[PDB]
Design a protein around this nucleic acid. Structure first.
Ligand SMILES: Nc1ccn([C@H]2C[C@H](O)[C@@H](COP(=O)(O)OP(=O)(O)OP(=O)(O)O)O2)c(=O)n1
Ligand SMILES: OC[C@H]1O[C@@](CO)(O[C@H]2O[C@H](CO)[C@@H](O)[C@H](O)[C@H]2O)[C@@H](O)[C@@H]1O
Ligand SMILES: OC[C@H]1O[C@@](CO)(O[C@H]2O[C@H](CO)[C@@H](O)[C@H](O)[C@H]2O)[C@@H](O)[C@@H]1O
Ligand SMILES: [Mg+2]
Length: 580
DNA sequence: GCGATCAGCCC
DNA sequence: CGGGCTGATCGCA
């Protein structure tokens, strides 16, 4: 049965009620400077569809959109807010976002459209976006009659589903998480995305030139050593050269052929000079294709800025993800790739990049939740946690900790957070399961509180069916009861890791909210640009650095109060690279 | 074209 | 052993 609604040619007062479900449709996946194809409004007075050129040109409608006292319920309000920012229109008063609501209730559902969210409550009087717009090359906006009914049905679903979703969030003790954390954060992310990050394209282009030269040299050297030319970028062709023509040992295989991952190649290096060249080629090629070419493809020609989109409702742990471009995985470990960061610069003259990061937030969170006396004491003394772990598991004094011991203790600490496993640790340290198991046992002997926590959290996940974070984020783990060892073990590691990674996500998200409030109160021009899981990157006038050096770490350190202190390091400079 | 496979970058 | 995104190649269409 078709849904009734008014296909309006003009905006009326009835459409501007102080409470409504609103749909500002942006079909393009990347909504930056994207078209708004239609608008739907559902309120106490009825259901309405408005053509964008009409509504967005109407003073009354624009004013309604920007009035904080006029409450709107939406799905993915950030998408609408940003698309409107590019049009110079402010969206305020969004009191409920169905996308974020669904995400908090169950991240695993992968809710990506109104239909998916509605199906959670047995509401199916709305079609999936893909069914309406199609996919890939076939994607397209349908004729007005079809478009209008779809947007109205989506607004109608939001209107009907708000109460049921809020009720369940309240039962889950997650309503404040939505209203005081995720929704306010959505607006902050919208500002960050819209501001974008300035890129020194000339810098990138020059790097690309030099890489091309280096790649040419290495490429030829490879063919020389192989005695023939082939596609190095083809694990298939490369495998034949290495394991068949050159007869190198097959230390590991892939489900479809020979493994050629860096991990394996490093072990084969002693056998043939071609290996190091392949590794070098892989390194340069990664920088060239993914970072130089990749970044240049998404930089806006007119402003020379890149505008990422932070997916706030995707990860199973509460973290954000970044796309087109992903600015959360810019090289830093290796000097060559690290130089790419010199291309990320302040958007204004005489401004600088300021970066602040939490020091070991995950292990500090673990110390807090596990209430491990030894681990808490370690952080209260602000000790080098890896050196400390080495001293405990290897039974030696600080002065007796060798570089290799610290390196292995560090790997153990990662495993503990990820959800320890002899097999996983062994592969990482290139040792045996028996040996790796010995490290684990020694770790738990030194940190019995952590052992108790790991045991207890797994039991809790099985009993309740899910685990939670400091701010009540939730993750269901149905596989925790599986009779399949591999499937069950993965779920157990998730039970151990989610509260840690998840709570760290909760903390930095609150820090971002607290920070923006402080920056506004202080009337600073500084503003957030990026978040990279445990770090915040801002840009600001050089005259604001001294104030930021005190303000940013304090706000981040005081976001939440744990049984151990939170510690934040910071750096600033002329480019992201120099913010070290 | 579309998508599984393999690779490698980040925290 | 935890959580992500993107680019290359290549079978399949
Ligand atoms: N109705 C609620 C209550 C709590 N929370 C989330 C966000 C809060 O910041 C966090 C802590 O809530 P409280 O301070 O009330 O702590 P509880 O009393 O919930 O203790 P516990 O966190 O151990 O459940 O949990 C929420 O989203 N909705
Ligand atoms: O707007 C982001 C928001 O939309 C979803 C779908 O509801 O993702 C879409 O937009 C992303 C940004 O361009 C794309 O990466 C993704 O492929 C597209 O479906 C949500 O997942 C997200 O929270
Ligand atoms: O002492 C058992 C020990 O094994 C773990 C897995 O390492 O859990 C197993 O035993 C539990 C019963 O005590 C089951 O609930 C669980 O499903 C099974 O895998 C640890 O959690 C536990 O400490
Ligand atoms: Mg750090």
């Amino acid at each position: 049965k078709k849904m009734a609604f008014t296909l309006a040619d003009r905006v009326t007062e009835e459409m501007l009620a102080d409470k409504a479900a609103l749909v500002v449709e942006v079909v393009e996946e990347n909504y930056h400077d994207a078209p708004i194809v239609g608008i739907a409004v559902v309120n106490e007075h009825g259901r309405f569809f408005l053509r964008p050129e009409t509504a967005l040109a109407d003073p009354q409608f624009v004013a309604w959109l920007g009035d904080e006292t006029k409450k709107k319920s939406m799905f993915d309000s950030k998408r609408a807010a940003v698309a409107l920012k590019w049009k110079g229109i402010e969206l305020c008063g969004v009191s409920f976002d169905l996308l974020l609501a669904a995400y908090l209730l169950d991240p695993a559902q992968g809710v990506d459209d109104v239909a998916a969210a509605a199906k959670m409550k047995q509401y199916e009087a709305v079609r999936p976006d893909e069914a309406v717009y199609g996919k890939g090359a076939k994607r397209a906006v349908p004729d007005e009659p079809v478009l209008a009914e779809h947007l109205v049905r989506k607004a109608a679903a939001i209107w009907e589903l708000e109460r049921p979703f809020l009720d369940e969030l309240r039962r889950n003790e997650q309503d404040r998480l939505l209203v005081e954390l995720e929704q306010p954060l959505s607006s902050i992310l919208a500002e960050m995305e819209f501001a974008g990050v300035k890129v020194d394209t000339k810098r990138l282009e020059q790097m690309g030139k030099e890489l091309a030269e280096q790649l040419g040299t290495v490429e030829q050297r490879i063919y020389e050593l192989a005695g023939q030319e082939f596609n190095i970028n083809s694990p298939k062709q490369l495998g034949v050269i290495l394991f068949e023509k050159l007869q190198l040992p097959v230390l590991k295989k892939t489900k479809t052929g020979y493994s050629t991952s860096a991990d394996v190649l490093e072990k084969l290096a002693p056998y043939h000079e071609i290996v190091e060249n392949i590794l070098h080629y892989r390194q340069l090629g990664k920088l060239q294709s993914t970072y130089i070419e990749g970044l240049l493809k998404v930089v806006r020609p007119d402003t020379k800025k890149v505008h990422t989109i932070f997916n706030q409702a995707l990860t199973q742990t509460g973290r954000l993800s970044s796309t087109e471009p992903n600015l959360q995985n810019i090289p830093i470990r290796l000097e060559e790739g690290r130089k790419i960061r010199q291309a990320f610069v302040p958007s204004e003259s005489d401004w600088l990049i300021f970066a602040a990061d939490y020091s070991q937030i995950e292990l500090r969170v673990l110390a807090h939740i596990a209430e491990d006396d030894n681990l808490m004491e370690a952080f209260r003394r602000d000790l080098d946690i890896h050196t400390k772990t080495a001293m405990d598991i290897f039974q030696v004094s600080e002065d007796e900790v060798t570089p290799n011991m610290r390196r292995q203790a560090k790997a153990v600490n990662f495993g503990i957070v990820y959800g320890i496993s002899d097999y996983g640790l062994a592969q990482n340290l290139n040792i045996s399961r028996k040996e790796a198991a010995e490290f684990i046992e020694r770790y738990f002997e030194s940190f019995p509180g952590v052992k108790r926590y790991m045991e207890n959290i797994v039991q809790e996940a099985k009993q309740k069916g899910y685990v939670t974070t400091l701010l009540h984020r939730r993750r269901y783990l149905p596989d925790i009861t599986s009779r399949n060892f591999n499937v069950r073990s993965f779920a157990e590691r998730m039970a151990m890791n989610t509260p840690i990674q998840g709570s760290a996500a909760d903390i930095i998200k609150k820090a971002m909210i607290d920070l923006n409030a402080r920056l506004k109160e202080e009337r600073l021009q500084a503003h957030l640009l990026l978040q990279v899981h445990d770090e915040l990157i801002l840009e600001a006038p050089k005259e604001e650095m001294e104030r930021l050096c005190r303000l940013v770490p304090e706000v981040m350190e005081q976001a939440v109060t744990l049984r151990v202190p939170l510690k934040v390091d910071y750096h600033y400079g002329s480019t992201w690279y120099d913010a070290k």
